[PDB]
Every structure is written in structure tokens, then in C-alpha cells.
Amino acid sequence: PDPDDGLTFRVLSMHDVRDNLRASFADMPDQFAIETRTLTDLFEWIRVKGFNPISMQQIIDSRAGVRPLPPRPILLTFDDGYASTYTKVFPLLAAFNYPAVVAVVTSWTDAPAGTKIRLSPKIEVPHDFFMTWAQLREMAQSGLVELASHSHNLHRGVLANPQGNEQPAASSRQYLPASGRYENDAEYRARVRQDLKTSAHLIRHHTGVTIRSIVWPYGAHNRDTDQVAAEVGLNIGLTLQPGPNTPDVALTQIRRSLVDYEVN
Ligand code: NI
Ligand code: NI
Ligand code: NI
């Protein structure tokens, strides 16, 4: 298995099965014949197998050669910013003293008061399904949680072609019905840049936190989005490619595994 070198780490992205919005357009990693366990049981598995959950700060420090990672290091991440992240996950993180990354879709968290969040063309959810800014700031101030961008409004599908086939918003040059054309490279870069910039500003404004990482929705990213993320200062990126993060893996291309859980 993985070399124990104070540098190589695994990342585990946790998804609550009751937030069942998975996407057609997205090309997610295979989940078939993988057992869904409870979150508490997951935290107990982590412990008993000898994993040592680490923070993003610890990753950065190991790369800079200041402090090596502990053995069997793992990064836990919780994206999308649903309310259960605060009421269920947060007190377990505290009880086990495990750090985590929480990645915020800021157009969801920051939606106008009294309005519903549209997730898909046929699905809207109440504003209060999501953690409040005050709740996120509290997690950030606990010392246990690193806040990250899950984009502002890239956590959805956009039109890839005239008929109606969808692709992830961040990856594709989107087709514009009003223009009668696709986005050009300049337009595309501008849209993704403004999105990332907005999510970082909103997070800093409301929590005081300067983020330094992006968790790409649906693992969708490319050369252009990585370059643009770098321009806005987000030099840490998390993908859906699985595998060990060995020293030759750039922190812009962090690998992670996806696992589903149930809460009680
Ligand atoms: Ni997500
Ligand atoms: Ni501001
Ligand atoms: Ni506000």
C-alpha cells in the first residue's frame, strides 16, 4: 500500500445520501456495490484502521518541508454546505478532534432571503436547507475546519449543444441561445474567473476567512480553469480523480475518493 514518507496522503470526500442530487451530465466515480455506512461508523473505521486525519494547513506545511504528515494521513472533506454539516458532522469532528475541509457553494449559502435555491431544472429547495454564514464562521473559528470554495454558481449543468445535452458549468464552453453561438475563450475564462473571485469575496466578507482552495463541482476542471483559479489565488484544487497524493502530484490536482454516508 501507500508509502509512509510524511508526504503522501489520501483525501476522502463525504456525501450524505439524503442529499441525493447526483448529476446526469457529470461523470462521477463508480459507487456500485459500495456499502453506505453511518457517519459515526465511518469515524470509527477511520480510527480503528489507524488513519490520522490532517488539516489542509498540515498538507501545505509538509510540502514546504516544515512538518511531516503523521502516518496514514487522510484529509476529510464535506462539500455543498447543507445544514447537517453543522448540526451533525461538526460535533463529531469536535468529539473525535478531526479536522476537515468544508466547501461552500456561495450562490446557495448566499441566496437572497426568502428565495428557493434551484438545483436542477426540475428541483428547487428551501433556503434553510443550507448552513448559515454565522454557522460557517463558527466552524472556521473552531480551528477544526478549513473553508473552501465549491464555486459561486458552477455547481450545475449548462447547455453544451443546441438540442439540450448538459455538461458541468465549469468545464464546457456553454452554448448561448440569445447570441446564437458558443462562448468564446475570453468569455469562458471571464465567467469562470468572476465566479471564483465572487465565492472567495463572499466567504471572506461573511466569515473573515481568506480561502486558498477550490473543490471543483463534479470534479470538472481543465487547463483553462486551473489557470484562472491561479489568477484569483486559489492554488489548491481538489479533483475527483482517485489515488494517492504522492509528492509528484501538484496541490492543484489533488486526488480524492468519494464515499456516501447516512446520518441518524
Ligand atoms: Ni458538490
Ligand atoms: Ni465585502
Ligand atoms: Ni451578506
Describe this entry's structure for a reader.
The chain is an alpha/beta fold and about 260 residues long. The chain has one domain (about 1-264): TIM Barrel (Alpha-Beta Barrel), CATH 3.20.20. The chain contains seven helices and 15 strands. The protein has helices at about 40-50, 55-65, 85-95, 105-110, 135-140, 185-205, 225-230, and strands spanning about 10-15, 35-40, 50-55, 75-80, 100-105, 115-120, 125, 145-150, 155-160, 165-170, 175, 180, 215, 235-240, 255-260. Strands 1, 2, 3, 4, 5, 8 and 15 form a seven-stranded parallel β-sheet that branches. The chain is globular, with a radius of gyration of 18 Å. The two termini are about 35 Å apart. About 35% of the residues are buried. It binds nickel (II) ion (3 copies). One nickel (II) ion binds next to loops.
Shape: globular
Order of helices and strands: EEHEHEHEHEEHEEEEEHEHEE
Summarize the biggest pleated sheet.
7 strands, parallel
CATH class: Alpha Beta
Q: Alpha-carbon distance between the termini?
A: 33 Å
**How many helices?**
7
CATH topology type: TIM Barrel
Helix content: 25-40%
Number of strands: 15
Bound molecules: nickel (II) ion
How much of the sequence is in beta strands? 15-25%
